[PDB]
Design an enzyme around this catalytic site. Structure first.
Site, mmCIF file in Angstrom:
data_model
loop_
_atom_site.group_PDB
_atom_site.id
_atom_site.type_symbol
_atom_site.label_atom_id
_atom_site.label_comp_id
_atom_site.label_asym_id
_atom_site.label_seq_id
_atom_site.Cartn_x
_atom_site.Cartn_y
_atom_site.Cartn_z
ATOM 1 N N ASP A 82 19.279 95.265 -90.356
ATOM 2 C CA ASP A 82 19.550 95.781 -89.070
ATOM 3 C C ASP A 82 20.335 97.082 -89.265
ATOM 4 O OD1 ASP A 82 21.115 93.421 -90.239
ATOM 5 O OD2 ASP A 82 22.444 94.025 -88.649
ATOM 6 N N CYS A 84 11.621 93.937 -83.051
ATOM 7 C CA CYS A 84 12.699 93.597 -84.020
ATOM 8 C C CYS A 84 13.722 92.728 -83.449
ATOM 9 C CB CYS A 84 13.290 94.830 -84.764
ATOM 10 S SG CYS A 84 13.523 96.100 -83.773
ATOM 11 N N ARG A 130 14.708 99.485 -85.789
ATOM 12 C CA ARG A 130 13.648 99.377 -86.831
ATOM 13 C C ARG A 130 12.179 99.574 -86.053
ATOM 14 N NH1 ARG A 130 16.427 94.101 -89.311
ATOM 15 N NH2 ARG A 130 16.826 93.810 -87.108
ATOM 16 N N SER A 131 11.769 98.661 -84.837
ATOM 17 C CA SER A 131 10.508 98.943 -84.314
ATOM 18 C C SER A 131 10.179 100.582 -84.393
ATOM 19 C CB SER A 131 10.597 98.237 -83.204
ATOM 20 O OG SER A 131 10.531 96.831 -83.280
ATOM 21 N N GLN A 159 17.800 104.281 -84.300
ATOM 22 C CA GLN A 159 19.391 103.808 -83.870
ATOM 23 C C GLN A 159 20.125 104.619 -84.696
ATOM 24 O OE1 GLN A 159 21.609 102.292 -82.055
ATOM 25 N NE2 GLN A 159 19.989 102.782 -80.669
HETATM 26 O O1 LIG Z 1 16.641 97.477 -85.458
HETATM 27 C C1 LIG Z 1 17.840 97.940 -85.846
HETATM 28 O O2 LIG Z 1 18.053 98.657 -86.752
HETATM 29 C C2 LIG Z 1 19.084 97.627 -84.883
HETATM 30 O O3 LIG Z 1 18.716 96.720 -83.882
HETATM 31 C C3 LIG Z 1 20.069 96.398 -82.918
HETATM 32 C C4 LIG Z 1 20.617 95.135 -82.897
HETATM 33 C C5 LIG Z 1 20.671 94.093 -83.968
HETATM 34 O O4 LIG Z 1 19.629 93.936 -84.864
HETATM 35 O O5 LIG Z 1 21.421 93.363 -83.727
HETATM 36 S S1 LIG Z 1 21.751 95.196 -81.842
HETATM 37 C C6 LIG Z 1 21.166 96.603 -81.107
HETATM 38 C C7 LIG Z 1 22.022 97.239 -79.876
HETATM 39 C C8 LIG Z 1 22.334 96.422 -78.988
HETATM 40 C C9 LIG Z 1 22.908 97.025 -77.590
HETATM 41 C C10 LIG Z 1 23.199 98.393 -77.580
HETATM 42 C C11 LIG Z 1 22.871 99.169 -78.821
HETATM 43 N N1 LIG Z 1 23.239 100.363 -78.584
HETATM 44 C C12 LIG Z 1 23.329 101.406 -77.616
HETATM 45 C C13 LIG Z 1 22.082 101.797 -77.054
HETATM 46 C C14 LIG Z 1 21.258 101.120 -76.247
HETATM 47 C C15 LIG Z 1 19.788 101.756 -75.596
HETATM 48 C C16 LIG Z 1 19.620 103.074 -76.304
HETATM 49 C C17 LIG Z 1 20.551 103.820 -76.929
HETATM 50 C C18 LIG Z 1 21.718 103.495 -77.456
HETATM 51 C C19 LIG Z 1 22.272 98.795 -79.740
HETATM 52 C C20 LIG Z 1 20.107 97.267 -81.764
HETATM 53 BR BR1 LIG Z 1 19.144 98.895 -81.423
#
Ligand SMILES: O=C(O)COc1c(C(=O)O)sc(-c2cccc(NCc3ccccc3)c2)c1Br
EC number: 3.1.3.48
Length: 298
Positions: free
Chosen positions: A180, A214, A220-221, A261
């Site tokens: 992640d 994901c 990741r998606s 991300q």
């Molecule tokens: O797949 C991965 O590599 C990581 O996946 C993930 C998460 C996980 O696997 O636990 S949590 C997360 C997340 C949750 C709330 C806010 C923001 N960040 C703020 C944000 C929200 C929407 C657009 C841009 C920035 C990020 C992301 Br994405």
């Protein structure tokens, strides 16, 4: 040109800036239904929501909401549905979407548990003798078989619409070693996984769009989808130079927020695409190299 640009961005160590530039230019659209009070418990993340214009709508009059987006890449002519990992209460909704959208494949890029927390509900049956029945959406899911490899597993499932007793085979591709907020082990293991999905025929336009998830359904998606679309665009024009990765990513981001991300996921996207181009341009030899190097047999 992507390969030259990759050298320059990598020589001047400016991936963070390049990545931020994309966040700055990214589309912003309303997500009003996702924010309705009645859909609070249907979202895994408060800050990750589907835009109203591209959200998948469940075909029910009660509540049609699911945190899922239809990323339709017009130029490439391939559509994907990116969604969150289903919550304990949205599994029926998840399979209702798969059925309604006529999807054939489901790509899961996360593990049920990551870093001590539950990133996704256990939405598919783990043993043949214990099938799952989703009463709210009236569907039945049965594990039929599964081919487990070192870093990923491919499951064959049978989804039945209890109301019509109609039956469909659903292929489940589960990448289990993608951290992640991280990146795949190597371009090889990533491409090897991508081609597995590709060769299953799940990405065929004859089927509904493939579902990709994901935990949040954007990181990741997002990386997975950007790489696939860029290779397809390149393939259709048989010219890797005519592909603007960042421009393509920004186009995807018109359909769902936050796709990809980290600056390293973006850098990795480049890696995967540049490597994948070899195959696209006639070097069918690399596909075996990626398999031999993913170490999938262990
Ligand atoms: O797949 C991965 O590599 C990581 O996946 C993930 C998460 C996980 O696997 O636990 S949590 C997360 C997340 C949750 C709330 C806010 C923001 N960040 C703020 C944000 C929200 C929407 C657009 C841009 C920035 C990020 C992301 Br994405």
């Amino acid at each position: 040109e992507m390969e030259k640009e990759f050298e320059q961005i990598d020589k001047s160590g400016s991936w963070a800036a390049i990545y931020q530039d994309i966040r700055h230019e990214a589309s912003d659209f309303p997500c009003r239904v996702a924010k309705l009070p009645k859909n609070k418990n249907r979202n895994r993340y408060r800050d990750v929501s589907p835009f109203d214009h591209s959200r998948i709508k469940l075909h029910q009059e009660d509540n049609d909401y699911i945190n899922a987006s239809l990323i339709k890449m017009e130029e490439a002519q391939r559509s994907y549905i990116l969604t969150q990992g289903p919550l304990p209460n949205t599994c029926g909704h998840f399979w209702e979407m798969v059925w309604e959208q006529k999807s054939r494949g489901v790509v899961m890029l996360n593990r049920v548990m990551e870093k001590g927390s539950l990133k996704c509900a256990q939405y598919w049956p783990q043993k043949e003798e214990k099938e799952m029945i989703f009463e709210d959406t009236n569907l039945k899911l049965t594990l039929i078989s599964e081919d487990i490899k070192s870093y990923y597993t491919v499951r064959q499932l049978e989804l039945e619409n209890l109301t019509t007793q109609e039956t469909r085979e659903i292929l489940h591709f589960h990448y289990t070693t993608w951290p992640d907020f991280g990146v795949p082990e190597s371009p090889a293991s990533f491409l090897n996984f991508l081609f597995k999905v590709r060769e299953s025929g799940s990405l065929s336009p004859e089927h509904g769009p493939v579902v990709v998830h994901c935990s949040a359904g954007i990181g990741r998606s997002g990386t997975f989808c950007l790489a696939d679309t860029c290779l397809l665009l390149m393939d259709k024009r048989k010219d890797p130079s005519s592909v603007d990765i960042k421009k393509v990513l920004l186009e995807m981001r018109k359909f769902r927020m936050g796709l990809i991300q980290t600056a390293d996921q973006l850098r990795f996207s480049y890696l995967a695409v540049i490597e994948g181009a070899k195959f696209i341009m006639g070097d069918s030899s690399v596909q075996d190299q990626w398999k031999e190097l993913s170490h999938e047999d262990l």
